[PDB]
Design a protein around this ligand. Sequence first.
Ligand SMILES: OC[C@H]1O[C@H](O[C@@H]2[C@@H](O)[C@@H](O)O[C@H](CO)[C@H]2O)[C@H](O)[C@@H](O)[C@@H]1O
Length: 184
Amino acid sequence: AGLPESVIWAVNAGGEAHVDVHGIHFRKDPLEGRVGRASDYGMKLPILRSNPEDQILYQTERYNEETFGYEVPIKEEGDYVLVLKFAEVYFAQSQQKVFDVRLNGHVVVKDLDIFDRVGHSTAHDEIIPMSIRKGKLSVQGEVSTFTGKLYIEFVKGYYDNPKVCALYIMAGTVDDVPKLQPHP
Ligand SMILES: OC[C@H]1O[C@H](O[C@@H]2[C@@H](O)[C@@H](O)O[C@H](CO)[C@H]2O)[C@H](O)[C@@H](O)[C@@H]1O
């Protein structure tokens, strides 16, 4: 299946519906008024590296002072890729905001420091392949029982607050995923 048809689930965190230049529909945030805090602070800033028609994805966020996450229903077995989109719109030094990302308890991004990787007011994406087969979730060489639901968690550590800007899941493998331009 082509790109839009292969997307099963997609969210614009802290924001409203938006269709990107590839035809992907990022839905309005399902956690509005429920878990965490929305912020549109970045809407005053140009976002580097991103396509300019799609900056609104990175200008809006959900963050929290305690651990929080999204629950995702998955209806069929197969190969999938999770894409997570971030930007740092407040700090401009390393070791100011740092946090882990977990999937069904497996640590899939350790010590994420958005500023250290890309700078201030600049797009950064994490790309995570996975497989769901024979009643099991497989990610980064680890395996556990799958019940029908994925839980995507942003973990509170010692350095400021965990956050996310947008996220989607597509059927396929990593060679099918659009990549951000080389940044440095
Ligand atoms: O919405 C802007 C950012 O809010 C939070 O950061 C806080 C900042 O607004 C200010 O109050 O300073 C404190 C540090 O003392 C920051 O924690 C979010 O954590 C951040 O992700 C937002 O971009």
